[PDB]
Amino acid sequence: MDNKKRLAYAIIQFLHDQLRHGGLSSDAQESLEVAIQCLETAFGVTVEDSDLALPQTLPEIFEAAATGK
Amino acid sequence: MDNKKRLAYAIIQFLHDQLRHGGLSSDAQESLEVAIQCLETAFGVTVEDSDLALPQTLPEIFEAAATGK
């Protein structure tokens, strides 16, 4: 299964609001915004991946699994 | 801890060789390449994150944890 779509889009969602929240620095954000739109086009994902969105955003899972393995 | 750096860079590594392998389509790859360099600048990560790289690349963990939760 193409979990990589969900990977991209879930990151898109988190980075979207992270951008709004101003988590990164200005230039970082701006570049990050480009990254988002590139990731969308890269994995060929869309907001249709929101229809099949997972209960929690994957970045959250990453903060658990990737930080503790 | 900034696991988000490791997130970005580990994805950078996988996407780097995925780009080379031609996993995505041409335009997707090209856009994905831009995404990589943007993610690098976004999270403010570098190849120094390779020095602190995790045993396995995080995309692998994602194929486990994100696909099965």
mmCIF file of C-alpha atoms in Angstrom:
data_model
loop_
_atom_site.group_PDB
_atom_site.id
_atom_site.type_symbol
_atom_site.label_atom_id
_atom_site.label_comp_id
_atom_site.label_asym_id
_atom_site.label_seq_id
_atom_site.Cartn_x
_atom_site.Cartn_y
_atom_site.Cartn_z
ATOM 1 C CA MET A 1 0.000 0.000 0.000
ATOM 2 C CA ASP A 2 1.123 3.536 -0.748
ATOM 3 C CA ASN A 3 1.702 4.742 2.799
ATOM 4 C CA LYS A 4 4.130 7.203 1.258
ATOM 5 C CA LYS A 5 1.162 9.300 0.136
ATOM 6 C CA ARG A 6 -0.122 9.476 3.678
ATOM 7 C CA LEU A 7 3.421 10.218 4.789
ATOM 8 C CA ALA A 8 3.624 13.210 2.471
ATOM 9 C CA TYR A 9 0.120 14.541 3.031
ATOM 10 C CA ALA A 10 0.135 14.119 6.819
ATOM 11 C CA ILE A 11 3.414 16.007 6.846
ATOM 12 C CA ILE A 12 1.794 18.559 4.504
ATOM 13 C CA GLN A 13 -0.970 19.117 7.070
ATOM 14 C CA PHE A 14 1.346 19.447 10.057
ATOM 15 C CA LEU A 15 3.799 21.646 8.150
ATOM 16 C CA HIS A 16 0.872 23.734 6.879
ATOM 17 C CA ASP A 17 -0.190 24.742 10.375
ATOM 18 C CA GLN A 18 3.410 24.722 11.593
ATOM 19 C CA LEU A 19 4.037 27.330 8.918
ATOM 20 C CA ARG A 20 1.100 29.346 10.214
ATOM 21 C CA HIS A 21 2.243 28.912 13.812
ATOM 22 C CA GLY A 22 5.723 30.054 12.833
ATOM 23 C CA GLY A 23 7.581 27.059 14.207
ATOM 24 C CA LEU A 24 10.605 27.576 11.981
ATOM 25 C CA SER A 25 12.357 30.829 11.104
ATOM 26 C CA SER A 26 11.206 33.172 8.310
ATOM 27 C CA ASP A 27 13.454 31.915 5.496
ATOM 28 C CA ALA A 28 13.001 28.373 6.768
ATOM 29 C CA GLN A 29 9.205 28.756 6.693
ATOM 30 C CA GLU A 30 9.197 30.287 3.223
ATOM 31 C CA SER A 31 11.407 27.437 1.962
ATOM 32 C CA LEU A 32 9.249 24.987 3.901
ATOM 33 C CA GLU A 33 6.145 26.313 2.157
ATOM 34 C CA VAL A 34 7.823 25.538 -1.158
ATOM 35 C CA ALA A 35 8.746 22.109 0.207
ATOM 36 C CA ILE A 36 5.084 21.432 1.025
ATOM 37 C CA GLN A 37 3.882 22.206 -2.493
ATOM 38 C CA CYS A 38 6.780 20.225 -3.929
ATOM 39 C CA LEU A 39 6.043 17.211 -1.693
ATOM 40 C CA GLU A 40 2.415 17.384 -2.814
ATOM 41 C CA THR A 41 3.492 17.218 -6.450
ATOM 42 C CA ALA A 42 6.332 14.785 -5.715
ATOM 43 C CA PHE A 43 4.313 11.972 -4.185
ATOM 44 C CA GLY A 44 1.438 12.929 -6.457
ATOM 45 C CA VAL A 45 -0.792 13.412 -3.444
ATOM 46 C CA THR A 46 -3.801 15.670 -3.049
ATOM 47 C CA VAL A 47 -6.423 16.719 -0.505
ATOM 48 C CA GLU A 48 -8.084 13.433 -1.473
ATOM 49 C CA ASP A 49 -5.496 12.027 0.911
ATOM 50 C CA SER A 50 -7.381 14.030 3.544
ATOM 51 C CA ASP A 51 -10.449 11.943 2.798
ATOM 52 C CA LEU A 52 -8.344 8.894 3.647
ATOM 53 C CA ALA A 53 -6.437 10.759 6.371
ATOM 54 C CA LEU A 54 -5.297 8.730 9.359
ATOM 55 C CA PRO A 55 -6.861 9.405 12.827
ATOM 56 C CA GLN A 56 -3.783 11.268 14.017
ATOM 57 C CA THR A 57 -1.234 13.129 11.956
ATOM 58 C CA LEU A 58 1.844 11.048 11.266
ATOM 59 C CA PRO A 59 4.374 13.664 12.570
ATOM 60 C CA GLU A 60 2.866 12.886 15.998
ATOM 61 C CA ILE A 61 3.625 9.194 15.504
ATOM 62 C CA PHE A 62 7.086 10.220 14.330
ATOM 63 C CA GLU A 63 7.683 12.143 17.558
ATOM 64 C CA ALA A 64 7.010 8.856 19.327
ATOM 65 C CA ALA A 65 8.513 6.193 17.055
ATOM 66 C CA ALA A 66 11.413 8.144 15.549
ATOM 67 C CA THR A 67 12.480 9.688 18.849
ATOM 68 C CA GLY A 68 12.176 6.369 20.645
ATOM 69 C CA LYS A 69 13.343 3.305 18.771
ATOM 70 C CA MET B 1 14.524 16.896 21.398
ATOM 71 C CA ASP B 2 14.456 18.003 17.777
ATOM 72 C CA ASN B 3 13.426 14.723 16.178
ATOM 73 C CA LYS B 4 12.032 16.865 13.383
ATOM 74 C CA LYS B 5 15.580 17.344 12.095
ATOM 75 C CA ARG B 6 16.074 13.610 11.906
ATOM 76 C CA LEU B 7 12.650 13.368 10.306
ATOM 77 C CA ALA B 8 13.659 15.769 7.552
ATOM 78 C CA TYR B 9 17.172 14.466 6.987
ATOM 79 C CA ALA B 10 16.240 10.769 7.068
ATOM 80 C CA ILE B 11 13.571 11.560 4.507
ATOM 81 C CA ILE B 12 16.209 13.552 2.585
ATOM 82 C CA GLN B 13 18.407 10.441 2.434
ATOM 83 C CA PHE B 14 15.641 8.079 1.346
ATOM 84 C CA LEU B 15 14.245 10.572 -1.168
ATOM 85 C CA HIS B 16 17.783 11.204 -2.441
ATOM 86 C CA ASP B 17 18.273 7.593 -3.485
ATOM 87 C CA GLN B 18 14.594 7.235 -4.365
ATOM 88 C CA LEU B 19 15.186 10.070 -6.810
ATOM 89 C CA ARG B 20 18.163 8.204 -8.229
ATOM 90 C CA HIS B 21 16.202 4.952 -8.369
ATOM 91 C CA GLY B 22 13.383 6.741 -10.164
ATOM 92 C CA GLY B 23 10.622 5.732 -7.782
ATOM 93 C CA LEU B 24 8.358 8.609 -8.763
ATOM 94 C CA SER B 25 7.653 9.977 -12.233
ATOM 95 C CA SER B 26 9.893 12.508 -14.016
ATOM 96 C CA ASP B 27 8.077 15.719 -13.050
ATOM 97 C CA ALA B 28 7.400 14.258 -9.619
ATOM 98 C CA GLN B 29 11.105 13.471 -9.146
ATOM 99 C CA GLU B 30 12.219 16.895 -10.332
ATOM 100 C CA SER B 31 9.727 18.534 -7.945
ATOM 101 C CA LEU B 32 10.780 16.070 -5.253
ATOM 102 C CA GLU B 33 14.413 17.098 -5.707
ATOM 103 C CA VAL B 34 13.353 20.681 -5.040
ATOM 104 C CA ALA B 35 11.381 19.447 -2.030
ATOM 105 C CA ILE B 36 14.516 17.790 -0.633
ATOM 106 C CA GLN B 37 16.598 20.959 -0.817
ATOM 107 C CA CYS B 38 13.695 22.956 0.589
ATOM 108 C CA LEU B 39 13.203 20.512 3.490
ATOM 109 C CA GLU B 40 16.925 20.775 4.218
ATOM 110 C CA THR B 41 16.651 24.553 4.452
ATOM 111 C CA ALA B 42 13.231 24.407 6.129
ATOM 112 C CA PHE B 43 14.151 22.359 9.174
ATOM 113 C CA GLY B 44 17.591 23.944 9.078
ATOM 114 C CA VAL B 45 19.169 20.515 8.842
ATOM 115 C CA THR B 46 22.462 19.512 7.277
ATOM 116 C CA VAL B 47 24.647 16.472 6.620
ATOM 117 C CA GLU B 48 25.657 16.924 10.262
ATOM 118 C CA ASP B 49 22.361 15.150 10.850
ATOM 119 C CA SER B 50 24.050 12.225 9.096
ATOM 120 C CA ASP B 51 26.630 12.175 11.865
ATOM 121 C CA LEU B 52 23.736 11.729 14.287
ATOM 122 C CA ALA B 53 21.778 9.582 11.820
ATOM 123 C CA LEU B 54 19.578 6.869 13.286
ATOM 124 C CA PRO B 55 20.468 3.161 12.680
ATOM 125 C CA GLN B 56 17.729 2.775 10.089
ATOM 126 C CA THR B 57 16.189 5.422 7.878
ATOM 127 C CA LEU B 58 12.942 6.733 9.299
ATOM 128 C CA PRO B 59 10.873 6.136 6.081
ATOM 129 C CA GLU B 60 11.381 2.432 6.874
ATOM 130 C CA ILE B 61 9.902 2.960 10.337
ATOM 131 C CA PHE B 62 7.115 4.930 8.675
ATOM 132 C CA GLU B 63 6.307 1.991 6.397
ATOM 133 C CA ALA B 64 5.782 0.008 9.584
ATOM 134 C CA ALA B 65 4.232 2.472 12.041
ATOM 135 C CA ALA B 66 2.265 4.671 9.634
ATOM 136 C CA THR B 67 0.905 1.759 7.616
ATOM 137 C CA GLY B 68 0.025 -0.172 10.750
ATOM 138 C CA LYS B 69 -1.397 1.817 13.633
#
